[PDB]
Symmetry: C12
Subunit: 111 residues, 12 copies
């Protein structure tokens, strides 16, 4: 079923909104070393919290698509924006895609 | 279930709205050392107040996602914005996620 | 009861509006020493007038969250903006949180 | 009760609207020593007129919150704006607070 | 009665509109000595024409609140703006206050 | 009564609209000596035409409020704007005041 | 009758619109000697064409209010703008005044 | 009558719209000697075409109001704008004046 | 008949739209010699194509009003804008005039 | 008739829309020699494609109005814009003209 | 039939949208050699994919109108914008033309 | 058929939304070498994920249209934007094309 792909919808929405708002904060002004270092850690934890809420099939997709940062290097503002954009896009794509596809399967069933 | 995740909604809304508006203030103008210092303390205190209003699952989720500032260093303007934006995003996603997920269950219980 | 938390609603609204408008005045233009010194005193009186209108449970929350300024130092524009923002956010959070939570308890009762 | 807090509504609205519009004028352009001096006097007088229209509880509340200017010094533009904004915010909160609180009592008296 | 406070409503509106439009003219561009000298005279006549239209109770209030300029000195642009703002605010406050208070006494009478 | 204050409404509207539009023109661009000189004369003439259309009470009110320019000096741009704005404000207040006051009497004659 | 004041309404509207549009042209860009000289002549002809369409009572009013330019001098841009503004204002005042006054006499007749 | 003033409406609208749009073009950018020269000729021609479409009364009115340019001098940009704006204003007033005046007669023929 | 004036409406609209859009192109940016030379030729052909679609009466009007360029000189940007504006204005005037005049003859026929 | 003028509507719309959008592109930024050269060729080709879709009358009309570029010279940016704008204007006028003229015939066939 | 011209509508829409969005990307910022080289290749493939979806009649039209780039030269930003604009215009023209023409054939059939 | 082209709609929407939002991020600010490098990898991966969700016909269409980046060179900001914009345009056209084409078939099956 299409609906079994997201095992914990409310959690995924919760982590997703956190990520989107962090990306918005980053876009607004230049960061410094300490916050870049922090955001990197948050990014790694984020992927795991997301995976906790998704079916294995999508964990494996997410794992193919994303990549944790080298722990011996603080990534730049731009790297972090890319890492977070990917997650936001995929997450909005994820929900919008399921709802759209589901709505269409119900429209075909009424005929 | 699901509603049981937030034991004290009004309290979480209250602390959340406080954090959000402080973030708005921080964003508006440059801070000084005393302001930063004060905000670090408010941050520590606000997490503690939030955790009081959350179910254990979410306390822990918060504990995994967040990191309190080192008490022997005043964090920068950017560090504080990231800390607060994380909380705002997560809290807004928390409530939104639950309403949305509850609503999908009620509509699935119609058919 | 959720409604017992604010013992004097009209007073809390009255002091809250005062605080919000002072914050707006401060944001609009640079202050000087005499007005900063005055605002500090108003801030201390404000917390007490608020506490006078709240249940003990919330007085103690407010007391954990806030902090009166050292009387031997005039705080900066930024410190005062932080101190006032916190109060405004918490106060709007307070009312919005109670009304929202109450509205939801009544919606669950009709089922 | 509650309505008994403002003994002379129309008078308080009249003095309040005067203060508000003076604050608008002050905000618009830089003042001179004679203007500041005049405004200090208007301030003293307006509090006295307000207190005439308030119940004793509120007279005292005002007395606790406000501070008349030292008569041997002309206060600055910023000092005057803070003084007036405090009054405007408090007065707007006063009326708003009472209507809102009265309305909640009347709606609670329906059910 | 609240309605006995303004003995000549149309006159007070007529003088009030004159004053408001003069204040608007003053705000628009810098004045010179001759016009400042003229405006001062108009201001003194204005207060009297207003008083002619008000109950004694309010004449005495207006007299406590306002102050004619020293005849041996031409006041500045700013002084004149303050003097006129006070009159406009009080006058709008006056009418709005009476109408509002009256409307509320009629709403209490229907219960 | 009240309507008897303006003996010639259409005339007063006509002269008033003329004054208002001259004020708009003056405000738009800098004048020269011949223009100022001409306007001073128009001013003198317009008051005389107005007085022709007013009841005696109001003629006198106008006479108290206004001052004709010294004929041996061309007044400045600012002097002319003040002179005209006084008239416009007073005339607009005159008509507005009468309609408003008449309307309150008619509504008071309903109940 | 109020309606006898304008003997040729369509002509007065025709000359009035011409004058208003010339004033608009003048406002838009600086003129030169030849066009100023032309506009002066048009202004003198205008007053006469207007007078041709008005009752004697108003011809005499217009004649008291206006003034043809000295034929031995080309007036400035500003003078011409003043001369034309006066005519436009008076003309719009004229029609608006008659229509307004007439409408009010009919409203009094229905009672 | 009144409709008999314009013998050829569609022609007058056609020539009028041409003049108006040339005025728009002139206003948009600086002209050269050949353009000015051409426009002077168009002006002469357009008056002649207009007069063909007007009743004798109005031909004459036009003849009184207008002045053809000296053929041995190319008029300036400002001269041309004044010439054309006069015609546009007069023509728009002409049609507007007639409709308005006709309409007032028809409404007066109702009662 | 008014409707016989335009023998080929669709053609006149077709050539007219072409001319209007060329004028718009010219207004947008500076031309060069080759395009000015081209536009001149188009202008001459345009007048003829228009004339092909009009009754003789209007061909002769158009011929009185317009003028082909000297073939031994490339006209300027401004000349071409004037030449094209005239055609556009007259053409829009032409249609608008006929439709308006026709609509009015039908309104008089229904009475 | 009239509809018989365009033998291939969809083709003419297709080629017309292509020309229009190329004109939009040309207008947006400066071109180079290769771009100009290419556009000249597209121009030649597009006329040929258009003529294929038009009735003989209109082929000829186009042939009279248009001029192909000399093949041994790359035309300028301005030359190309004029060439294309001519076509767009003519084509838009073509379709518009026919619909409008057809519509007037159908409405004339009602009465 | 008009509808047989596009054998694969969904494919043509798919390739068309790709092309339009590439053109938009190119317009937004300056390209470099590698991307210009890539876009050239995409342009050649595009024409073929389009042709795959069209009737032979239109393949041949498209082939007459377009031109693949010399493989021994990387075209400029401008050339690529021209090449892509042509395709977008023609494609939008294509669909709009067929739908419009079809809609008109159905309107003629209902009479 | 037609619906059989996209075997996994929700997946294609998900990967598509990810690509689109990365393109938005790239467009917003300048990237660095690590960001570019990461994006190249994401690009390779996203095509592979897309192909998994498409029918064989479309896999191949994609394979013909796209080109993976050389792994021994980090592509530029412009190269990445072109790569991503191609995919977005194609994917949006893909879904849009299918809905539109399906809709035309269903409406053709009505009549």
């Amino acid at each position: 079923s299409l609906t079994d792909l997201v095992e914990q919808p409310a959690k995924v929405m919760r982590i997703g909104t956190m990520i989107k708002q962090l990306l918005e904060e980053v876009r607004a002004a230049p960061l410094d070393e300490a916050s870049r270092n922090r955001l990197r850690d948050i990014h790694a934890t984020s992927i795991r919290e997301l995976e906790d809420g998704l079916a294995p099939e999508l964990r494996e997709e997410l794992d193919r698509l994303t990549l944790p940062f080298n722990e011996d290097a603080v990534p730049s503002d731009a790297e972090l924006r890319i890492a977070q954009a990917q997650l936001v896009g995929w997450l909005e794509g994820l929900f919008h895609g399921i709802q759209t596809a589901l709505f269409a399967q119900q429209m075909a069933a009424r005929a």
